Every structure is written in C-alpha cells, then in structure tokens.
Design a binder for these strands. Structure first.
Ligand SMILES: [Mg+2]
Ligand SMILES: [Mg+2]
Ligand SMILES: [Mg+2]
Ligand SMILES: [Mg+2]
Ligand SMILES: [Mg+2]
Ligand SMILES: [Mg+2]
Ligand code: NA
Length: 97
RNA sequence: UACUCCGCGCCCCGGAGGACUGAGGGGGAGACGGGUUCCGCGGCGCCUGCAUCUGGCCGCGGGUGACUCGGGCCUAAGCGGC
C-alpha cells in the first residue's frame, strides 16, 4: 500500500555517556531501536548505504545528523534507506502513502 | 587499539566500509627440533576453557623425482688404533 516515513536522527545525542572507541556500533544499535519505535515493528533491515554513512568518519566521530527513509513491507518488516540532504534546517517527520 | 551492514550466523565464506602489524614485520624463506601436523573429499561423537556450519580435531583416499643443490671425500680442535 506504500506507507513510507521520513525522519531524522541526532547521532551525537545517541552516543552521550558512552566511550568514544565504540561510537559507531552504538549508533547502529540506536538507529535500530529508534526505527522500531517509529514504525511499530520488530524486524528492521538496514541498507549498507546507511552503514557506509555512519562509518564515514571512522569509529569515534560519527556524523551529527542523518535523514532516514523507512518503508514498511502477517509478516511485516521495515527497510531503511539513507537519504542525502544538503541541510537539515526545518526538517521534520513526513508520512507518505 | 576493532569491528560493522547485507547474503547468513559477534567468531566460517563473499561484497562493501572502517582499522591494525609498520621492511630489527603478526611479511617471504632456511638450520635445529617435531614426525605426517602437508593436499582433496566428507563430518561434528571428542577437543577447539563462549559458540561453531570452523579447525593443526575425527574418517577415507593421496603426496617428497637431481651428472650440475647438500651428504658420501679433505683435514681443524680432538678421538681411536699400534
Ligand atoms: Mg599504524
Ligand atoms: Mg618452507
Ligand atoms: Mg591443513
Ligand atoms: Mg588426525
Ligand atoms: Mg656441489
Ligand atoms: Mg653429489
Ligand atoms: Na574488505
């Protein structure tokens, strides 16, 4: 039926309080949990594009913000895609389909 | 110093990303010692102080070619015989 979400996650907020030597894997787990909360599902599959974006600065200094693209797919699962944006000014959740 | 995503599973394999050993090497080869640990196929009963679909583990088959490389010859420090 084509239900697609658009959302941004603050990655620097999700690694507050954790050692910097494990920033990127912690960010991956935070992305998965937040997506499960947003899509009301339990099976989240991340595209390697978001993985590349998350690791683009090494293991310590993750990018500050990321804009995601969630498309829902009695066996429902969410597929997440990275969307590249020029700026995050005045960007909020959009619900399409 | 260290893993992550997807196929597929933190540990096997593949692709993509991120790192490390840093030419007195966690590289490439020999002497001594070990003695089949080497290779292919199959497997997880034991072991692989977590797991295992992995393995120097278990089963079945294979594998080392010299006129020119080394030993066999010479003699050293020595040893033996007379
Ligand atoms: Mg270095
Ligand atoms: Mg050799
Ligand atoms: Mg072998
Ligand atoms: Mg054996
Ligand atoms: Mg010769
Ligand atoms: Mg000869
Ligand atoms: Na690689």
């Amino acid at each position: 039926m084509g239900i697609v979400y658009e959302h941004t996650i603050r990655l620097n907020k999700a690694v507050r309080g954790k050692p910097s030597k494990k920033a990127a894997p912690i960010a991956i787990r935070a992305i998965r949990a937040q997506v499960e909360k947003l899509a009301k599902v339990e099976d989240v599959r991340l595209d390697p594009s978001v993985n590349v974006f998350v690791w683009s600065r090494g293991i310590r200094h993750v990018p500050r913000r990321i804009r995601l693209e969630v498309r829902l797919e009695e066996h429902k699962f969410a597929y997440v895609i990275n969307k590249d944006v020029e700026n995050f000014k005045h960007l909020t959740t959009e619900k399409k389909g």
